[PDB]
C-alpha cells in the first residue's frame, strides 16, 4: 500500500511508525489547606435583614 504496487522488491521498507499510546490520564495537584468560611457565609448564626 505504501509502495503503490502489488509486487515489492527485496529489501527493507519504511512503513507507518510505532507509537506507545498512553495507558491512562493522571492528575496531581497539591494538598488543600485554606477553604472559604462557608460556615460563616451560609451557616451564619442569624442572617441579616433585607
Amino acid at each position, epitope marked *: 500500500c505504501t509502495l503503490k504496487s502489488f509486487t515489492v522488491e527485496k529489501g527493507i521498507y519504511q512503513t507507518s511508525n510505532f507509537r506507545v499510546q498512553p495507558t491512562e490520564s493522571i492528575v496531581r495537584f497539591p494538598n488543600i489547606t485554606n477553604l472559604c468560611p462557608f460556615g460563616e457565609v451560609f451557616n451564619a448564626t*442569624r442572617f441579616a435583614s433585607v
Partner: nanobody, 115 residues
C-alpha cells in the same frame, strides 16, 4: 453568648434617657451596631444603625435620638430627647462585624413613656 442591655426605665415626657449596648470582644474598632424597638402590642421597627463612623435615624427618631459610641470602653450611648408616648417599646441592640457575623441576641430592656 448575649449582649448586655441597660438604660431602660419608666419616665414621663421631657425626660432624659441613655440606653447602653456593650459587646465583649477585642475588635470593637470594626464592630457595627443595628438598633430596633418593639412596642407592646405593636410592630417591631428599626431605630438606628451606626456602622463604622456613620450615623442615621428613622422618621420618628431623627434629631430625637443622638446615637454615639465609646471606643475606650466598648460602650454605645443613645441620648434620648423629645419623649413621645407612642414610642414606648422594648429596644433590642445588635452587634456585628463588617461581615455581619458574630451574631448575639440582646435581651432588651423595658422602656416606657408616660402620657
Amino acid at each position: 453568648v448575649q449582649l448586655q442591655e441597660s438604660g431602660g426605665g419608666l419616665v414621663q415626657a421631657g425626660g432624659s434617657l441613655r440606653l447602653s449596648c456593650v459587646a465583649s470582644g477585642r475588635t470593637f474598632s470594626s464592630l457595627n451596631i443595628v438598633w430596633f424597638r418593639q412596642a407592646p402590642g405593636k410592630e417591631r421597627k428599626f431605630v438606628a444603625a451606626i456602622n463604622d463612623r456613620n450615623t442615621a435615624y428613622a422618621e420618628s427618631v431623627k434629631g430625637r435620638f443622638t446615637i454615639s459610641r465609646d471606643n475606650a470602653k466598648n460602650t454605645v450611648h443613645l441620648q434620648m430627647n423629645s419623649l413621645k408616648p407612642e414610642d414606648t417599646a422594648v429596644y433590642y441592640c445588635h452587634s456585628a462585624d463588617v461581615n455581619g457575623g458574630m451574631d448575639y441576641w440582646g435581651k432588651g430592656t423595658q422602656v416606657t413613656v408616660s402620657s
